[PDB]
Amino acid sequence: VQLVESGPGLVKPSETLSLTCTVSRFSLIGYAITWIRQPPGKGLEWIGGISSAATTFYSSWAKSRVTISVDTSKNQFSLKLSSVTAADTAVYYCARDPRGYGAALDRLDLWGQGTLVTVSSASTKGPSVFPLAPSGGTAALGCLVKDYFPEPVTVSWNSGALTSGVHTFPAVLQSSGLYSLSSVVTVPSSSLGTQTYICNVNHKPSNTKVDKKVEP
Amino acid sequence: VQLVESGPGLVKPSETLSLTCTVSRFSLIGYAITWIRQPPGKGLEWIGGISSAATTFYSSWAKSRVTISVDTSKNQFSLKLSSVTAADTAVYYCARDPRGYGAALDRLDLWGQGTLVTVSSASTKGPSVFPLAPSGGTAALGCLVKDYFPEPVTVSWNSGALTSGVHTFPAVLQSSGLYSLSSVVTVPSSSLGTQTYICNVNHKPSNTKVDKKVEP
Amino acid sequence: IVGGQEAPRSKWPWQVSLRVHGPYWMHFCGGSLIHPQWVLTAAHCVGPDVKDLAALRVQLREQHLYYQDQLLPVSRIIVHPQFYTAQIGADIALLELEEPVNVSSHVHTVTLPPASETFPPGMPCWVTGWGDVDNDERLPPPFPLKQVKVPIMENHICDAKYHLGAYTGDDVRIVRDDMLCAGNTRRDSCQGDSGGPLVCKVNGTWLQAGVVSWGEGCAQPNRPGIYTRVTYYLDWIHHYVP
Amino acid sequence: IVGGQEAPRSKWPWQVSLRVHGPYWMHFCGGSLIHPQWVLTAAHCVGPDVKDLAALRVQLREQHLYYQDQLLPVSRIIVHPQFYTAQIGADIALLELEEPVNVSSHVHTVTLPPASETFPPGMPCWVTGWGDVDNDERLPPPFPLKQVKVPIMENHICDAKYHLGAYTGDDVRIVRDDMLCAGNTRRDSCQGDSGGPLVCKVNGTWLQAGVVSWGEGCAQPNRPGIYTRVTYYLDWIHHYVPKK
Amino acid sequence: IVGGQEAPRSKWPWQVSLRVHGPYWMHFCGGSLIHPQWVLTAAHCVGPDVKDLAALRVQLREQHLYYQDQLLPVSRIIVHPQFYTAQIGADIALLELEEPVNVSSHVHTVTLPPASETFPPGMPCWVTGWGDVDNDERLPPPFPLKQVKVPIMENHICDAKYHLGAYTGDDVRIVRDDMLCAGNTRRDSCQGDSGGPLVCKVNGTWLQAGVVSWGEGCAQPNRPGIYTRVTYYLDWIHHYVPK
Amino acid sequence: IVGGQEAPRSKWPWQVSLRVHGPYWMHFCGGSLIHPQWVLTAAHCVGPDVKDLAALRVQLREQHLYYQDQLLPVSRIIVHPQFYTAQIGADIALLELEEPVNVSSHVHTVTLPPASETFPPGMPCWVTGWGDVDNDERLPPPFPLKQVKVPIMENHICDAKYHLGAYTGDDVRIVRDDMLCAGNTRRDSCQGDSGGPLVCKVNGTWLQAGVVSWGEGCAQPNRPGIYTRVTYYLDWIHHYVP
Amino acid sequence: DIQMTQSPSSLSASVGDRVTITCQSIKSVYNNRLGWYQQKPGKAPKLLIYETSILTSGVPSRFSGSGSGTDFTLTISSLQPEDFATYYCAGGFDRSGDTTFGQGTKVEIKRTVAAPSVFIFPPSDEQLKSGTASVVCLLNNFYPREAKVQWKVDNALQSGNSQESVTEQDSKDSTYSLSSTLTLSKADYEKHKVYACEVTHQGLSSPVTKSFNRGE
Amino acid sequence: IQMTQSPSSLSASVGDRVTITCQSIKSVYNNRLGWYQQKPGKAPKLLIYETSILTSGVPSRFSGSGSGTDFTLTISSLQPEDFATYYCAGGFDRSGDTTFGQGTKVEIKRTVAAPSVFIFPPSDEQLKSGTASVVCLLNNFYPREAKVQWKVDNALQSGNSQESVTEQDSKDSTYSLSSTLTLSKADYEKHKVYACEVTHQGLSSPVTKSFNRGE
Ligand SMILES: *C[C@@](*)(O)[C@H](CCCNC(N)=[NH2+])NC(=O)CNC(=O)[C@@H](N)CCC(=O)O
Ligand SMILES: *C[C@@](*)(O)[C@H](CCCNC(N)=[NH2+])NC(=O)CNC(=O)[C@@H](N)CCC(=O)O
Ligand SMILES: *C[C@@](*)(O)[C@H](CCCNC(N)=[NH2+])NC(=O)CNC(=O)[C@@H](N)CCC(=O)O
Ligand SMILES: *C[C@@](*)(O)[C@H](CCCNC(N)=[NH2+])NC(=O)CNC(=O)[C@@H](N)CCC(=O)O
Ligand SMILES: [Ca+2]
Ligand SMILES: [Ca+2]
Ligand SMILES: [Ca+2]
């Protein structure tokens, strides 16, 4: 059983963020879907939810600016948040109460994967990928994924084939208001020049895919 | 599903090793049990087996001095090895062929835990436990389990509570004809004098259980 | 429902259908809306064992099962403390709904009787449900709600009938004072009808006389259907239900 | 029988198998030979409804069902008058055989206890039968008689366990004084074992402590097996069965 | 076996029972010992899908199932390559036993016929097995081996009967040349009898004429049982089984 | 239908449900309206044995079985003469209705293809029915008509797949020339879907490519669903159907 | 939106230690409506305990829930390295919207001191076409998190340009990897010649310096 | 009729493809060839049976291939836990012609890590009895190949030493070694400076850990 959040990753302030939760290989007839958000680095916050009997319940805050609905025909649940600020920048989750409650939180058994929504006046920018070239027994090499917006960026090596020793660091926000990230990997100082090392960088917000072959 | 080997751990030479393979919470009516042995440090060797139709098959060697049987009313399989020498000192395993073959080896799905059988004229001796006292950031401490017979000896720390950093070394046979063994553990130097460090030594052959508190 | 016909859309607005999770939210018992936040059912439907509420939903009055379903969550199960088995007695339970129902023309509550009400033979009584049409015979699709007019039988008359073709001593009571008898070999309630209502017209008003409880078989000779006598448990019901 | 092993040929000579007509005389309950002309069983096996005796036969102690059968006719069924259902109580019955059995080494009677016998925890008791091996799990062919050592539990302790995870009020008694408790989640009697004996060794003799009656499921947590306390009904049994 | 009685302890020493793992090694098909290392059965019992041999055992001639079992392992399953379904044909298989059977008075092989043998009506034939006693009716405990004398019917006669109350064109053959017909509404083989033998007395010797294969229902009007004509596959059997 | 979703009210107007008498006129096979007086179905649904027409009715396109039924009588059953079993082939039949259906927006006929049509892989094909949702798994109430987009596989490719993990010789053909392959382990037709249509969009029009015939299990590894190739039997169909 | 208090907000414990996280409210919980969630970084929360004490199937027995009314407790009898996560309690006070989540409790593993593997990466010749330069210092696999990285350029101490980012504690070895990135303009990167990062850590006896020469 | 495994031992990095071949002169009876994985102090585990069939629960990185006389076990992406001795086992007939292969020891190749060298003087309890036992510990290092020298009053020792290695760690892939110097109480009192000089690849210069018999 799966729950999937869908919606725009970047929203300008004062606008309205619109998200949908979709429920694959199951139409949950007697169940309830609630929406939860999580500011980056902060904790879980309840937005609201819809019951088994299609009844909406909204948290103390929100209420005024939030709307939750169901399209049984589409197997979809909607979330609409008007007049957004940088305070609404969070990871949006939809979860199921197997008792079909609507205003519960204590038994959210199934959860969505989460969807990052960034509220910013800033425009989307694709990253510039730079090689961190290897220079005894150990051999460290990586990729510098500089100046992109917004988050996220996905870094794989050799198209998924290299997973061990890989360390994709969390993105740090620069003075520029742009993100910069590094993905490193430790390999033997025998495999270099014999093995091809490519970091695959993917920025979905800007439809950018860069493949960068690192060499000594 | 479990297979359990039972029998004497120490056998004097010229005598007969008698082992039983008991089969808990499962009826193995259409199945076959084969016996395998493994000399210490050496590889797997086939002794013989009994088929689904109670037919015995014995390996090239052994044939003469080995007897395998079934007690259907007890769910037991026997192995009897006459005129034992130090060449028979091994770990004895009983395994199941789910095709009920009797002379197979290529599909031994269930296995017993293994039973060590030591063939010696020597008498059982309990170990003497000595502390390996700690001496500047991360300290090492242990227990010297000296002069015991036969194998094995089980060493735990703080009655199972301390598992990380624990290294119980393989036993070494001494000139005396006894075994010596060390169990070490790495801990932060800061934790010494604040944390209690006890090694729990157990020699089942002699019904010895020693608990030693290691101190600086 | 053994015997009887399909109920008109209008009739029995208090009728509920209890559901259980699985390949679908399948019907397993009936009950009655006695308050916008309460359902009255049989304890054997939901007990004596504690049930996971995740596995239960209530479906309000609709003509056929599963076609126009809108499943309501339950927040509490209150089984009578004296209940262990149907034949022992106290086969009565209350379900508190997580949300109050918006009452209408098609969906509204049933009136409970005064304690003084006896429900004697001759009384025009009806039992309703989506349960078995005969012994080990399920209600076929499209699953219409069924109704049957059942004759009320006095407890001693009914208990005497229950002893016919039984080893049980005549002095040993089978039909207990918290129970009520209704039915014959042609008209009766059956498995899956449990919890559902036995209503009788008393001075132009429908009062729930009983709750579908037990019986030996379905519409069997000398074995009328046994219902829990609602009058017996009024005080308990009203401790929870306004 | 849930848990436990296949009984040796020698053991439990009093064990009977109740049969019902059909494509074959199928096993449905057990019982015990308490007299050469009488068999002690549970009432729910044969009641509360009146049964046609043409549809019933008794099979004396044999290792496996149906392989070496000699079906004995029953002449009378005597169900305790206080019996309606197992949970209510008085789940005890007597079958009078049309012919007296010639007792032997493999087929003989079980001793009933004195009234003074309480059967407290610790006692070494055993339950025997050809019933279900687990919940909704039949005993597979060749149908061997099974035995299991079950632990005796006091009535109030057992009653308290029966209330755990139940809505039933604590003041509302489930395990009644004419009942006895035995079993755990690994060792227990099951459907088809009914009427069979619960025997305990008391000063070197096997006494039938109980008659397999009921229970919630088979070997379920906080649900021990409930048996009819034979002491409770001794006077009734002996109204029909010769004292000796 | 539909109709017929319980076989005497002596009779049918070649009769085997095929077992499948589960809460017990349950009977699911029959077969015949045709060689001390080979059992002849129906392909539909063990195919067309490839089966794990861990899930199969052979039980030699005994009076009742499960009472005195000694389960024998199988080392190889050889299904006729032309086999897909029973109605299509080639419903024949061989099981090679891991150990040879030491033949006795109660357990010995059945004689296969010469290719020239036709098995015409009138022939005293018997079919044996532990399968269904009637349609959707299992053999009750104590599971005795059953036997029934069945009348042999000619293929074209049988094929004509199969077309009665069927939409299938008369020119469209149902009973194929690798098949044989036997039975009536009172005497027949049924589900669980498959792979089992149809033996006929030919000049004082029992020869296996057929292998229990298929049929519409069990002992149904105008539906005699269909068996695999053993003569048809003699060359194939003897490619594996020593003469 | 294994995999796939509930069909919209609009889609598949040619879809029929074959009914068998009993406690209710239960669904057992599907079929397609190919003419206002004719139904195209699988022969195994109605044969090889001669069936009493008293035991059969046809139900035209509706969203859920049994809720809005209007059962139509059948006057004739025409099973292909070459039919004995599904695996042998010729698993095709025609039902002549006693009365012609009044065609509309929700209920109308499906177009049969020209003989020249091959239906190669890549083709957008859909199979529809009220049959099993998985192996030995019935469609639960309220019984919605289900649809699944299935991938077309070439006969030799399919035939090769059918031999994987089978004792049948490679030279022995399983998938016959009067047959067509479609499905995978996630998308497939199942028991109760037989007679139903496999329709493909060919130059903006829906043509019935196949008739649900057989397969080893439902959506099993290396076992695609097998259908009767409609092109193969066009001449036979049109001997009866205008 | 605060109605429930978790204590502590963060804790550090060794492997095998008993861990107790308390959740408290001023209003009493509605119908034992109190659940516990485990959130591993960059993943949706997992329901461990529901309805105060009921354990989600598959969840290890080391997790238990206890309490009633206003005071509740999550217990981890023998803390495992994988148990590193943020733990959230969530409760219901009514059925119409009075439900919240607790603050969260970051559970951190305490392990033996581990020294980092220090690496240096010069800025790519491709990145020096654009106006910026990025020197990357890597600190691979260490405990504790608390380390000091110093960027010395021509021996001058640098302040107001470097940015570091830590990986989340590994699920296996419980270590941390850190990346310190020095950012200067192209003008400033050619202005100097020797670049190095002086790493001070607990696991190092004396600070480790890794450098390079601009040109070689 | 025995079976030859090749190589007898191999060392590979994490993520590497590992190929162990099993070969015989007589052909295998009926695809009767299985692969076993034996982790130290544990019963062998059946991974592959009937040449290519994978035991349920066993990771997809394990595959079996081959026929007749030549077979191969493949580990597509070697994991640290995959350290074990792998044995093939085959059948040539049904009446006793079955053997196991000599086995192949698979070892993980990780970056060179230096040991943590520690020294332990005899305990006063052991000292009260006739013997003295000095212990040198080398903690968590790679490769296994290390040299420990015992020096007594700066004098090379021979004969009175016995070392024991731990089996490679399932998680971090390192080894630990213990060297024990056994001396008579009479000889232990005869000397003052006890040292264990450790020579490893991961050490720039040999590490010497000592104690003066006195504190
Ligand atoms: C719980 C509910 O579905 C049923 C229905 C009551 C039956 N009504 C009439 N008139 N017989 N209640 C029970 O099943 C309670 N148990 C019993 O009634 C048993 N005495 C009979 C069980 C049976 O035959 O299935
Ligand atoms: C009548 C007899 O064969 C059975 C067996 C007693 C079950 N024993 C234990 N230890 N659980 N007696 C009954 O079935 C009497 N009825 C009940 O026990 C019912 N409470 C439930 C029956 C069920 O779970 O199917
Ligand atoms: C495989 C074996 O158990 C049976 C026995 C053959 C039936 N014998 C006679 N005389 N009818 N073989 C089959 O069941 C093969 N398949 C069929 O017979 C099918 N045509 C229908 C099976 C059925 O009606 O159950
Ligand atoms: C008659 C019709 O409802 C079914 C459905 C066809 C199965 N479809 C797919 N895609 N797998 N047709 C049959 O059952 C025809 N016979 C067979 O399919 C047999 N090979 C197996 C029958 C079974 O498993 O029940
Ligand atoms: Ca049960
Ligand atoms: Ca049939
Ligand atoms: Ca099927």
Q: Which protein residue has the closest C-alpha to ligand 1 atom 1?
A: C194
Which ligand neighbours the alpha carbon of E84 most closely? 4
Name the CATH superfamily, with its identifier, for domain A4-119.
Immunoglobulins (2.60.40.10)
Could you tell me if H154 and H193 are in contact, meaning their C-beta atoms sit under 8 angstroms apart? Answer: yes
What angle is formed at CA F4 by the lines to CA F1 and CA F6, rounded to 5 degrees?
85
| DSSP string of G4-49, one letter each residue | EEEE-SEEEEETT--EEEEEEESSPPSSS-EEEEEE-TTS--EEEE
Give the C-alpha separation, C84 to D159, whole Å: 12
Cα–Cα distances in Å, from F158 out to E50, F90, F135, F184, F202? 18, 18, 20, 11, 22
| E235 in active site | no
First-to-last CA distance in chain H? 63
Indicate whether residue C69 lines ligand 1 (CB < 6 A): no
Resolution in A for the shown PDB structure? 3.0
Number of neighbours of residue A63 by Cβ within 10 angstroms? 12
The residue length of chain C stands at 242
Q: How many Cβ atoms sit within 10 Å of the Cβ of residue F72?
A: 18
| Domain B128-214: top CATH class | mainly beta
How many helices (H) and strands (E) in chain C? 3, 14
Q: Cβ of E141 and D140 within 8 Å?
A: no
Neighbours of H76 (CB within 10 A): 14
CB atoms within 10 A of CB G148: 10
d(CA G188, CA D224): 83
Q: Tell me whether residue G103 is exposed, middle or buried, using C-beta atoms within 10 angstroms of its C-beta: 0 to 12, 13 to 18, 19 or more.
A: buried
CA torsion angle G9 G14 G16 G18 (round to 10):
-30
Peptide bond into C48 cis (omega under 30): yes
Helix (H) or strand (E) holding B188: strand B179-188
- Tell me which long-range contacts E5-12 makes (C-beta under 8 A, separation of at least 24): E5/E146, E5/E147, E5/E148, E6/E144, E6/E145, E6/E146, E6/E147, E7/E63, E7/E128, E7/E144, E7/E145, E7/E146, E7/E147, E9/E63, E9/E106, E10/E106, E11/E147, E12/E61, E12/E128, E12/E145, E12/E147, E12/E197, E12/E199
What per-residue string of b and e applies to D35-64 under the rule 16 or more CB within 10 Å gives b?
bebbbbbbbbbbbbeeeeeeebbbbbbbbb
Q: Are C223 and C217 in contact (CB under 8 A)?
A: yes
Among B142, B164, A41, B183, CA closest to G110: B164
8 A C-beta contact, residue G64 and residue G52: no
DSSP, res H113 = B
- Asked if H136 and H182 count as a contact pair (C-beta separation under 8 A), the reply is no
- CB contacts < 8 A, B to G, total 18
Handedness of CA H176, H181, H182, H185 (dihedral sign): negative
Total CB pairs under 8 A between chain D and E: 27
Closest CA to D209 of D123, D81, D113, D134: D113
Is G28 in CB contact (< 8 Å) with chain A? no
Return the closest-CA partner of residue H135 out of B173, B144, B167.
Answer: B144
Four-residue CA torsion sign, G14, G15, G16, G19: positive
Rounded distance between C-alpha atoms, residue E177 and residue E196, angstroms: 20
Q: How far is C101 from chain G (nearest CA, A)?
A: 14
Please determine whether the domains at B2-119 and B128-214 fall in the same fold group of CATH: yes
Tokens 């949950």 -> residue: A28
- Report the C-alpha gap between G64 and C94 in whole angstroms: 31
Q: Give H141→chain G minimum CA distance, Å.
A: 14
**DSSP tag of H168:** P
Best of F191, F213, F216, F222 to mutate for ligand 4, by most ligand atoms within 8 A of CB?
F191
For the beta carbon of residue G68, count every other beta carbon within 10 angstroms: 12
C26 touches chain A (CB under 8 A): no
Active site residue C44: yes
How many other CB atoms sit within 10 Å of the CB of residue F65?
A: 23
- Angstrom CA distances, E149 to E110, E190, F22, F206, H26, stand at 17, 14, 38, 58, 50
Per the structure block, which two tokens stand in for E210?
């057929």
SS3 call for H142: strand
Query: Tokens representing G147?
Result: 């380390």
Residue nearest atom 4 of ligand 3, based on CA coordinates: E191
The Cα-based distances of C155 to C200, C209, E163 in angstroms read: 17, 14, 64
**Of C236, C230, C232, whose CA–CA distance to C110 is shortest?**
C230
CA pseudo-torsion sign D135, D139, D145, D148 = negative
Residues facing E111 on adjacent strands: E207
**Is F61 within 8 Å of F107 (Cβ atoms)?**
yes
- Experimental technique, in short, is X-ray
Give the span between the Cα atoms of D50 and D76, in whole angstroms: 11
CB B53 within 8 A of CB E99: yes
- Do G15 and B164 make contact, defined as CB atoms within 8 angstroms? yes
For chain A, which residues make up each domain, given as ranges?
A: 4-119, 128-214
Residue of C172, C163, C156, C175 whose CA lies nearest to C225: C175
Q: Which residues of H are less than 8 Å from E99 in CB distance?
A: 94
Contacts of H205 (CB under 8 A, 6+ apart): none
Among chain E residues, the shortest Cα distance to D26 is held by E141
Residue A210's nearest CA partner among F144, G126, G29, H104 is: G126
Q: How far is CA H125 from CA A195, D24, E69, H133, H185, in A?
A: 58, 79, 65, 11, 12
Phi, psi of E28, deg, nearest 5: -140, -15
CB under 6 Å to ligand 3: residues?
Answer: E 29, 42, 44-45, 86, 131, 183, 188-194, 212-218, 225
Cα separation, C225 vs C219, in Å, equals 7
Asked if F230 and F171 count as a contact pair (C-beta separation under 8 A), the reply is no
Hey, what are B4's tokens?
């359990």
F159 is catalytic: no
3-state DSSP of chain D: CECCEECCCCCCCCEEEEEECCCCCEEEEEEEEEECCEEEECHHHHCCECCCHHHEEEECCCCECCCCCCCEEEEEEEECCCCCCCCCCCCCEEEEECCCCCCCCCCCCCECCCCCCCCCCCCCEEEEECCCCECCECCCCCCECEEEEECEECHHHHHHHHHCCECCCCCCCCCCCCEEEECCCCCECCCCCCCCEEEEEECCEEEEEEEEEECCCCCECCECEEEEEHHHHHHHHHHHCCCC
Q: Which domains does chain G have, with CATH numbers?
A: 4-110 (2.60.40.10), 117-213 (2.60.40.10)
**Which amino acid, residue H14?**
V
Contact E220, E150 (CB under 8 A): no
**Which DSSP letter does residue G164 get?**
E
Q: What is the DSSP string of F155-174?
A: HHHHHHHHHTTB-S-TTS-S
**Cα–Cα distance, C165 to C176 (Å, whole number):** 19
Give residue D235's identity as a one-letter amino acid code. Answer: D
Length of chain F in terms of residues written: 242
**Closest CA of chain H from E98, distance in Å:** 6
Write the CATH number of the domain with boundaries B2-119. 2.60.40.10
Judged by DSSP in three states, H189 sits in helix
